[PDB]
From a paper:
To better understand nucleobase recognition, we solved the first crystal structures of EbPPK2, both as a complex with polyP (2.3 Å) and as a ternary complex with polyP and the non-hydrolysable ATP analogue ACP (1.7 Å). From the opposite direction, a polyphosphate tunnel enables the entrance of polyP into the active site. The basic tunnel, also observed in other PPK2 structures, is defined by positively charged residues, namely K29, K70, R75, R188, R192, K198, K201, R241, K242 and R246. The terminal phosphate of polyP protrudes into the active site and appears to be optimally positioned for the nucleophilic attack of the terminal phosphate of the nucleotide.
EbPPK2 is a class III polyphosphate kinase that accepts a surprisingly broad range of substrates. PPKs catalyse the transfer of phosphate groups between adenosine-5′-triphosphate (ATP), as “energy currency” of the cell, and polyphosphate (polyP), a linear polymer of up to hundreds of phosphate units, as energy storage. While PPK2-I enzymes prefer the reaction from ADP to ATP, PPK2-II enzymes favour the reaction from AMP to ADP. The PPK2-III enzymes catalyse both aforementioned phosphorylation reactions, making this subclass the ideal source for enzymes used in ATP recycling or ATP analogue generation.
Numbering used by the authors:
A (entry chain C): 2 to 303
B (entry chain D): 3 to 299
C (entry chain B): 2 to 302
D (entry chain A): 3 to 293
The structure:
Amino acid sequence: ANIYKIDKLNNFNLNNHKTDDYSLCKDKDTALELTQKNIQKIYDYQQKLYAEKKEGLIIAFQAMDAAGKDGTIREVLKALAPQGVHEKPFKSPSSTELAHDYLWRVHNAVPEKGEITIFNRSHYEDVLIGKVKELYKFQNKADRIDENTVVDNRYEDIRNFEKYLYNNSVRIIKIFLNVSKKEQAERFLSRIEEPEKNWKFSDSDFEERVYWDKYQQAFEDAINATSTKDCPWYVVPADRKWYMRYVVSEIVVKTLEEMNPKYPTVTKETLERFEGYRTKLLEEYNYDLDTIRPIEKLEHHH
Amino acid sequence: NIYKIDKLNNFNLNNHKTDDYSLCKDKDTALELTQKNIQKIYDYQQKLYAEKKEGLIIAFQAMDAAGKDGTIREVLKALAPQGVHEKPFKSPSSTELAHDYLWRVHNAVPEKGEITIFNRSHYEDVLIGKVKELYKFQNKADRIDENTVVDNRYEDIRNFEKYLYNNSVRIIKIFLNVSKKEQAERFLSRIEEPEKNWKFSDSDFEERVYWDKYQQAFEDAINATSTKDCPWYVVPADRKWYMRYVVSEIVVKTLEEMNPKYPTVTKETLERFEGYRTKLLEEYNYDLDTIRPIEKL
Amino acid sequence: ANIYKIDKLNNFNLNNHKTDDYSLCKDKDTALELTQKNIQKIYDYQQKLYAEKKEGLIIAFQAMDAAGKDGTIREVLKALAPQGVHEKPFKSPSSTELAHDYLWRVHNAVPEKGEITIFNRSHYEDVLIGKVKELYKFQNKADRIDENTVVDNRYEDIRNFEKYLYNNSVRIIKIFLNVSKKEQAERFLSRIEEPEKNWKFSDSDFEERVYWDKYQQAFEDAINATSTKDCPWYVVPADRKWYMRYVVSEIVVKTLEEMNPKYPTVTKETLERFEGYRTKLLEEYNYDLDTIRPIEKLEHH
Amino acid sequence: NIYKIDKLNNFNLNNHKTDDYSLCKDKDTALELTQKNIQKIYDYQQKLYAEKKEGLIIAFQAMDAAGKDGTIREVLKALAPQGVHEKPFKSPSSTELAHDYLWRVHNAVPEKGEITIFNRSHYEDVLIGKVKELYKFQNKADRIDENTVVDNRYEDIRNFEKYLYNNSVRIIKIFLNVSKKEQAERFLSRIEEPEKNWKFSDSDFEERVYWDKYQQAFEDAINATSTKDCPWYVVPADRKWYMRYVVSEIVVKTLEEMNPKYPTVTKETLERFEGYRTKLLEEYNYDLDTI
Ligand SMILES: [Mg+2]
Ligand SMILES: [Mg+2]
């Protein structure tokens, strides 16, 4: 029972989850090395997952600007080999995406069995900025859609979507990077003061600060309404980058371990065909190949 | 409607005969009524497209030669091409099987203001998928319990269709209920007319062996997923003229509940519009056709 | 059509193509009837095209606002059955579409063999509004892209793309609906004055009128640079709606007729299996089916 | 150099040996140089992603067990996940066959600022497509002349790749040139190690019968589609360490010609930014970490 894992409905108080907790590993150097170990194991699990083609994984990060989503995705999951991997940032919806229903663009990006898709922001956008700014009141919708129940029905629909995925061999890790307002300001200052990060800063990043408290409430309500055993939320303290990377590497490793991927074994009958192909290849080259069965090699002429 | 099912666990297939014609016994009457329904469907579609508020899926699920393509063609050829997609769900590709079963369906959901026609549907996964137990041969995670795969699909389908309803997309579900003898007559016709040979295949004939199991799978699907907001319509399919009539009635009545209207523009837009009108009139010295009086300053 | 078909490079003078020509059929009632005939034949060709699964067709309409694109697509092509048909309006590109290359969203919408896709506007937007407003100067691109060869390279690339399609069993009909500025103004007035058309008018429709002459020159240059025998341009006078509908029905019919679709005939071997299935079905029902060969029924009972 | 082909009709396969190692004969040296190249690739990728001006396709085309997956994995696992897609072109689906052959390729072309890796490519349609003459059995229009189908594909591919170039997308084309006996040793290894069985199939073995025809089809493709802007790289594939080294050099050298930079902001944005900085400082009692 992680102190950071939320696995039941209506069981979540945001004020109790401090942004600068570090209780799993107080020493930074220790955490950096444990993080390198976790990364090795992630890469190993990914190769087994890709080979088996049985289960898919979404790793979804949801948080305020400069909480640490891109830096964490980059530092922890750059371990992954390119095969089977997609990263999908959910930006402001296009005209076409708004003309469809809100889970249409999300479901499209769900991974294949054997593959991993990383979500930078997610379908939770529609009960975060969507609830705070009440965007549903300005968007086109049928007159029979009752505005007072739009948000409640998104919590239901999100629960049902995530459980649909679970039942069809796609897991989702949901990660809230819980950063404080002052730490966000320090990181914005850093985006302004360092040339190589200027591109990352925009007007509306600054202007969303005015809605800080409403966003905090909307995270609290979302996590209360969509945490289950099969689709838990993880609330990760985000004020220290080294710690936050450590904790995300732990969550990813532990989920891959429950999924327990293995290189597939081939059937009895395929194995027999395979032995026939082995003999043919060996005969083509008069047993001059590197077999791991040395005794048969000594049998044949040269 | 004797043909609408709008509640769970309320459906007996044996009571829904394939040759019922109780709504309209005279063929020539039904052909006339079908033409009026078609004109109204065209009118509603122009309003639905202009308003961009609600989407419609029209889904047809039935055995081979029940009448899906002939009905879609005769009833919905009235539709203008704008905002219209037709999507036949064939056997899944590799990529579709590597994704989850609703992935390819959700991708074809229409935009608000649009109509998408489904020839076969997500219901494939509790019909041929239940009868041939395809889930046992497909790749899936070890933790997936095979004994509950079908019940979980009924739940997930109900929840998916209610999600769509809540986000401005309706679905009409139509089961064309054809008898096995009538299927055989239509297959014979696909064999004996050159211009229909292309439509006949080996596996169409071979699926007849599974007739009864498919009938049970339709019964179970309709028991498990009929709701007020997402009803099933069980349409007798033994006569083409009757079946086209009934489908025209269902489509027209759904579009009328949706009640699309050309949008009215705000008072402020109307004022800018007047400014544009005066400019145009002045550019051409009042030598345009207007239906409204000209006031000058 | 034929005084209106352009099938050669650098062979196009827009001033010789009047917006109100009506020389193919001067009588409106005649043209309405000929249009209904063409429409039946289009539907018949479409069913054979769909059954054969050998060739695809793009029907692309490019023109100024209220030239008549939507109402022509609606009145002439609503004959088509829904199967195998898509309509794709090219609006201003999304973020994602701008981040990709300009033909990416067009090629995505190319139809399958046996199918018809209608383009309302097209890839030609990138040498029309794209040339007129020089949008390429503000868009993201690599430093090595030379700005004053961007448009010439689009003409080359468009020719090459269209020839690529032709070689892979997809034809394109390109139709320019050539409307006058005055007639556009009358139709805008009608969009403002009639309740049911208000939705169709926007601010920027009016403001683009200031660029009218530049747009006309850009259509001239495009047609000069991309008309070929296999990918011709059709310049259709658009000032009268009945005439424009008639002429477009003729272009679509004549193209479907060159494509010459046929219901496929099955191989000798498939025909024999089919006869075995026929006997089986007949036996299942002791010959009480509607065969086209009733003499065989006399043997049985 | 010896390995880059950048002109039409200038390519003799018999002169490009599978076990050449002339760029770096010492394996340990090549492993070290490979680590340096990989760090530089990561740095370039971050700048390419930030600038959103140019896209990069890295396409690998070769026989089974030439080394495509293991090279892609060992060299490009350095890359961060952001802006990266890997796309294997397997046998076309019935929907992909109902479209034209470049349709599924063009769909996967990357956005500006992004990198897409192709395992196999559009060249499939003049390799297995030429060798097995698949075009004769596929649906097409009656007017398509079968005797010119392949030459029109060379033209169309040249024009497609030139189109991409002109719209900010480069393609690296890499042929991993493996010998038949080395393929057999790697297939043997896929059969003898349980952990690799999944990688082996019946049809991998059966394609060997067409080895010579496939060699001729790679020769013809490289003759027909090598240009200055879209060159081919013929990389000897018989040793994995050497092949990974050379591919890291090609990717690095291409990123360096593209020359991505973190974008510079305008004078006016810099000033707004100063205003935001003072505000943030004032909101907190000047209590923030700054230079
Ligand atoms: Mg990586
Ligand atoms: Mg129609």
